Each structure stands twice: as structure tokens, then as C-alpha cells.
Amino acid sequence: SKIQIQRSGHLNLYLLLDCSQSVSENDFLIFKESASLMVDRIFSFEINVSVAIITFASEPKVLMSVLNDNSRDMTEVISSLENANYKDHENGTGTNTYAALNSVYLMMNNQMRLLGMETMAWQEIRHAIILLTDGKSNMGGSPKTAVDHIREILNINQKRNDYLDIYAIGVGVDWRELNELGRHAFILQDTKALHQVFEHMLDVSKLTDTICGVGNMSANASDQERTPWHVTIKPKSQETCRGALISDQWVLTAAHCFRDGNDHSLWRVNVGDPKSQWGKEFLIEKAVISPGFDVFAKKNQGILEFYGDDIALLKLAQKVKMSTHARPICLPCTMEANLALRRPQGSTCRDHENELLNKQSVPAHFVALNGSKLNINLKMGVEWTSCAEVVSQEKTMFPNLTDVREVVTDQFLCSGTQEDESPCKGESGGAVFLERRFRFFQVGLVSWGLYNPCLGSADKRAPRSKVPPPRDFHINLFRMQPWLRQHLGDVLNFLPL
Numbered sequence: 001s002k003i004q005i006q007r008s009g010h011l012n013l014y015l016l017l018d019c020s021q022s023v024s025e026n027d028f029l030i031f032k033e034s035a036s037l038m039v040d041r042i043f044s045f046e047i048n049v050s051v052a053i054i055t056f057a058s059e060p061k062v063l064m065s066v067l068n069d070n071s072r073d074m075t076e077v078i079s080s081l082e083n084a085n086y087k088d089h090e091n092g093t094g095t096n097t098y099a100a101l102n103s104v105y106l107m108m109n110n111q112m113r114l115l116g117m118e119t120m121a122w123q124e125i126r127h128a129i130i131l132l133t134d135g136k137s138n139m140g141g142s143p144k145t146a147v148d149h150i151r152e153i154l155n156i157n158q159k160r161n162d163y164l165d166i167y168a169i170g171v172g173v174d175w176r177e178l179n180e181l182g183r184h185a186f187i188l189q190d191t192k193a194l195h196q197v198f199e200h201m202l203d204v205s206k207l208t209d210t211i212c213g214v215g216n217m218s219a220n221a222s223d224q225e226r227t228p229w230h231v232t233i234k235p236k237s238q239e240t241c242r243g244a245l246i247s248d249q250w251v252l253t254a255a256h257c258f259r260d261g262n263d264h265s266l267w268r269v270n271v272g273d274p275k276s277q278w279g280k281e282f283l284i285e286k287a288v289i290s291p292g293f294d295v296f297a298k299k300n301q302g303i304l305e306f307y308g309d310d311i312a313l314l315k316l317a318q319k320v321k322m323s324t325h326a327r328p329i330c331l332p333c334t335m336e337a338n339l340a341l342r343r344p345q346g347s348t349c350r351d352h353e354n355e356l357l358n359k360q361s362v363p364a365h366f367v368a369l370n371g372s373k374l375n376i377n378l379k380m381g382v383e384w385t386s387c388a389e390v391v392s393q394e395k396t397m398f399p400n401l402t403d404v405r406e407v408v409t410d411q412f413l414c415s416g417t418q419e420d421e422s423p424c425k426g427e428s429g430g431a432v433f434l435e436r437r438f439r440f441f442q443v444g445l446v447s448w449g450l451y452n453p454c455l456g457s458a459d460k461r462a463p464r465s466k467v468p469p470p471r472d473f474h475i476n477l478f479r480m481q482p483w484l485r486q487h488l489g490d491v492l493n494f495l496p497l
């Protein structure tokens, strides 16, 4: 069961696409979309993978081979998949699943020759063959003959089952004949349905690596698995807070969470755990609260609460085991985040800001007390000012306010307009993150806001639209780089400013 995701060895992925009369032209188009995502996902784990693209009907057509160096290049693979045409199998309309699997075998036999039989370069390659089909084989003989042949050239045993996986997926179909080819057989309708199931086809537990911004993309997975960087913080307060793993023992949070003293020996960090229901709890070795933070710094000006430099770093007393439940999030302007973005090597922090925050309204997220993922729109450029200006109506926090720039600076990101969710106080410190090509990036850090949904309060989350009005400001990590560098330069490899 499952394809293995690990730094060890190599993965040869072979995507076989049905093109017979059985499959309509609209059906093959959704195979194309389903094969793209598979390629996109398998390249998002930063592992050594090669993708072969084959279409088959009466005979197989190889569009990408693992013998080609381009099979290790995401762009090239997908282009040879975008250029795939249904009419290419009009002159042969049958279903010859044997010949198509034999193609893969002829490719494996060729790759043996290239690298060497006795070589590590061959025997470390794990093989996964995915057939986007419905079954209904009608020529070429039994597909079993080819599967046996692949087993023989790969030496498959009970101690070597990890080296061969055959899947047969129906999208848009014979049930038990797919189990013949392959539970390694699935019947699916939507492409978004396959996106879910492909998540379950992958085994990541053996990726104890410190890779950032990797999560589980499917429901049926726990909230902790989808947002594995998310931690819960307890200070000397009972007042709950949130934060984010940015490495194996550093967590990024809000400074306003520790408004009772800097003695950290009474604080707890709660990390996700694969065995535990409640997660592993960690003690703190040392804290780094921004020297510039001071809630009552603007008290004499009238401003009761000022959240400038609202940022803090906690070093845990022990390393966190990287797992399906606990991984660091990608922090922008690092080499870590750079590889995640598939960027070139000469990238700067300025490049990263432009890539990630690209529109004037950017859809981001933050995680609720619930644990589930919530949606927000970061307002940039000219939209930022009209987003920020609304703070001029709050007079419970700011009585003698004339200048908005005094409380809200470009140091803050702005969200909370229209149908945005507003974070609660317990959710502050939590990460404000984006998803790009299946990877997760923290652009921000929940700090303050004009309305608290949980301040109902009793147990609920209410908005209300005659209050003047709800709006939320997060610390902008891009504006916070010299500090992050100052303290994390051993932990992360930062890029030029």
C-alpha cells in the first residue's frame, strides 16, 4: 500500500492514460487534469522523482520517458502532458493494457542498461505505475504477463514490496477488473475527488526531514495534519495563544501573549503528535521577545493599546520530531522557502514578497481555535489604506486619534473586509499563511483587530454588520526581516535582503 515519499533513493512515476473508444474525449480531458495534479503533487515534496507520460489504446505512446533527463523537470513533464491529444489514438481504438504495461517494462529494461544492473543507481529506484482507465481490456493478451515481468526485473519480495506499486483509477468502469491490474483500484467522479484520493496514495511517515510548508491536502485527514506547523501556547496567564513552528525547535508567535513577565519556565508549547490525541507538550529553553514591543508605549498620546513590534521567538527545550503532525512552515526570504517556490538561486527577499503578495487583494488563511482553516483577504497597495483607515472609527481603543498611521503602520498586513473571518484573541499569535503549488508560506502573524467574534462570549463566533466595523491587522514578516535574521541565522539560511 501507498507510494513512499522520502529523501532516500529515487521514485519513478509512470502515468498511463486510457484513450480507447470506451473513454470519451471529455473523459480523457479529465484524465489530463488528474495527471497534471499528480505530477504537481509529487514534485512538491522536494524528492528525487522521474515522471513517464504514456497514452495507450491499441498501442502505447510514450510522450515522456524516465530515460530522458526532462522526466526530472516539472515544467517539461507537464508540457508533454498538455500537448497530449485524444485523436492520436483514432487509428487504433481498442484497449491493450498489456502492451501499455509492457511499455513500462521496456522502459525499465532500458534504464537498467543505462545505469547498470548491479548499481545502487538502479536498485534504489522505487516504481509506481498509475493507470487512468476503466478497464475493459480487449487485445494484447493478459495484463498479468506484463505485471509478472515487471516483478521479475525488479525482484519483488515480501521484503521488497516497497519497490513496486500499481494503481488503476477510474474517473468519469469495471470494478473487479481494476483490482486485477492493481485496494489499489479506485472509481472516482471529480478531479477534486482524485486530488483527495491521491493524498491517501502517498506515504510520508518516513520523511523525518526538516522540510517546510508540507501538509495534507485532503479532508478525512486531521486538522493537525493539514496545518502541522500550528502550535498552542500557554503563558503564565491561562490566556491561550497560537504560534507556528519555523524549524525543529523554534516557534514564531505574538509578543502580546506574554503580558505577565518574561519568565518562560512557566510557559508551555503544544505541538501535534502522531500518537497522542492532545499532542506533545514542550517546555521552553529561552525566549526572544522583540525589544520594541510595548502596549502602553503610546499611552500618553491617548492610545491605550499599541502593537508595534508584536513578535516573539521561543526556543523549545527539546527538538520536535518531524512527522505527519508536526512540521515547520516555510518562512519567506529563506533558501528553504526558495526551493519550495521552485525559484532560481539568485532570489532576494524582495523577489519573494512580490511573488507571494502579488495582488492588491490576496487570499490568505489563519487557523481557528476550532483547528480548522479560515479564509481572509490581505489588502495591499492602494487597497491597504482604505482597509487601514477604518481604524479611525474605534474610540474605545483610540480616543484622541487623528493620525491613523500612529496605530497602523506598513509593519502590519490588513484583512477583515467583506466576508473575511476575524481572528479571536485566543487565535492571536497564529500564522497568516498562503498556499502556493501545494506548499505553505507564513506571510504574517495575527496581532490585533477591531472586533472579536468570540467576545460574545459565553462559550460562538458572531460578526454583526452595524458595528463600525470589524478589521484585522497582522505583523508583516517581510517588514520584520532584520530581527528574524538576528536570531534565526543559525536556524535558517536567509537570502539577500
Ligand SMILES: *[C@@H]1O[C@H](CO[C@H]2O[C@@H](C)[C@@H](O)[C@@H](O)[C@@H]2O)[C@@H](O[C@@H]2O[C@H](CO)[C@@H](O)[C@H](O[C@@H]3O[C@H](CO)[C@@H](O)[C@H](O)[C@@H]3O)[C@H]2NC(C)=O)[C@H](O)[C@H]1NC(C)=O
Pocket (backbone or CB within 6 Å): 088, 089, 090, 091
Ligand atoms: C490515421 O490515419 C490518417 C489517414 O491516413 C490514412 O490514409 C489512407 C489513404 C491510407 O493510406 C491509410 O493507410 C492511412 O492510415 C492520418 O491522417 C493523415 O492522412 C493524410 C492523407 O492520407 C496524410 O496526408 C497525412 O500525412 C501528412 O499530411 C500532411 C498534411 O497534408 C502532409 O503535408 C504530409 O506530407 C503528410 O502526407 C496523415 N497524417 C497527418 C500528419 O495529418 C493520421 O495521421 C493517422 N493517425 C495517427 C495514428 O496519427
Ligand SMILES: *[C@@H]1O[C@H](CO)[C@@H](O[C@@H]2O[C@H](CO)[C@@H](O[C@@H]3O[C@H](CO)[C@@H](O)[C@H](O)[C@@H]3O)[C@H](O)[C@H]2NC(C)=O)[C@H](O)[C@H]1NC(C)=O
Pocket (backbone or CB within 6 Å): 002, 198, 199, 200, 201, 202, 203, 204, 205, 215, 216, 217, 218, 220, 221, 222, 225, 324
Ligand atoms: C494524509 O493523511 C492521511 C491520514 O489521514 C494519510 O494516510 C495514512 O497513512 C498512514 C501512514 O502509512 C497510515 O497509517 C498506518 O500505516 C502503516 C503502514 O505501515 C500501517 O501499518 C498502519 O496500520 C496504519 O495504517 C494510515 O492508514 C493512512 N490513513 C488512511 C485512512 O489512508 C496520508 O498518507 C496523508 N497524505 C499525505 C500526502 O501526507
Ligand SMILES: *[C@@H]1O[C@H](CO)[C@@H](O[C@@H]2O[C@H](CO)[C@@H](O)[C@H](O)[C@H]2NC(C)=O)[C@H](O)[C@H]1NC(C)=O
Pocket (backbone or CB within 6 Å): 368, 370, 371, 372, 461
Ligand atoms: C469550526 O469553526 C468554524 C467557524 O466558526 C465553523 O464553520 C462554520 O460552521 C457553521 C455550521 O456549519 C456554518 O454555519 C458556517 O458557515 C461555518 N463558517 C465558515 C464560513 O467557515 C466550523 O463548523 C467549526 N467546526 C466544528 C464542527 O467544530
Ligand SMILES: *[C@@H]1O[C@H](CO)[C@@H](O)[C@H](O)[C@H]1NC(C)=O
Pocket (backbone or CB within 6 Å): 007, 008, 009, 047, 048
Ligand atoms: C537526488 O539528486 C541529488 C543531486 O541532484 C543526488 O546527489 C542524490 O543521489 C538524489 N537523492 C537525494 C534526494 O539525495
Ligand SMILES: *[C@@H]1O[C@H](CO)[C@@H](O)[C@H](O)[C@H]1NC(C)=O
Pocket (backbone or CB within 6 Å): 196, 197, 200, 219, 220
Ligand atoms: C475521505 O472522505 C471522502 C469523501 O467523503 C470519502 O469518499 C473517503 O472514503 C475518505 N477517505 C478516502 C479517500 O478513502
